[PDB]
Design a protein around this ligand. Structure first.
Ligand SMILES: COc1ccccc1C1=NO[C@@]2(CCC(=O)NC2=O)C1
Ligand SMILES: [Zn+2]
Length: 99
């Protein structure tokens, strides 16, 4: 079961790569609600800019904006600088399509 970019079909992740709960409903400072699925691994993304800790939803992690490497759609964030695990992907579920 493969996760693709909803806009262009870019290969992003797999159900097998979900990181357990795997679903987190969060809000950013602009009040936008994101239903975020955590993945151990993802591909086909472009990480833009430098990591930031500001308003991180996950204690001990910095985020980098993750675009679809193909169409540039915002699919979520790469998280790093934490412990167990050091890195993971928080992807916006409704911006993916499952096979
Ligand atoms: C309007 O947005 C911002 C403006 C300024 C600084 C940060 C943000 C952010 N929006 O969403 C983020 C995504 C990563 C995260 O874990 N938490 C968030 O809240 C970061
Ligand atoms: Zn795309």
């Amino acid at each position: 079961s493969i996760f693709r970019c909803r806009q262009c079909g870019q290969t992003i992740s797999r159900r097998d790569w979900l990181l357990p709960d795997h679903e987190h409903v969060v809000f950013n400072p602009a009040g936008m609600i994101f239903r975020v699925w955590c993945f151990s691994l993802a591909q086909g993304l472009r990480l833009i800019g430098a990591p930031s800790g500001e308003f991180s939803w996950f204690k001990g992690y910095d985020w980098t904006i993750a675009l679809c490497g193909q169409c540039g759609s915002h699919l979520g964030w790469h998280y790093e600088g934490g412990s167990q695990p050091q890195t993971f992907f928080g992807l916006i579920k409704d911006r993916l399509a499952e096979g």
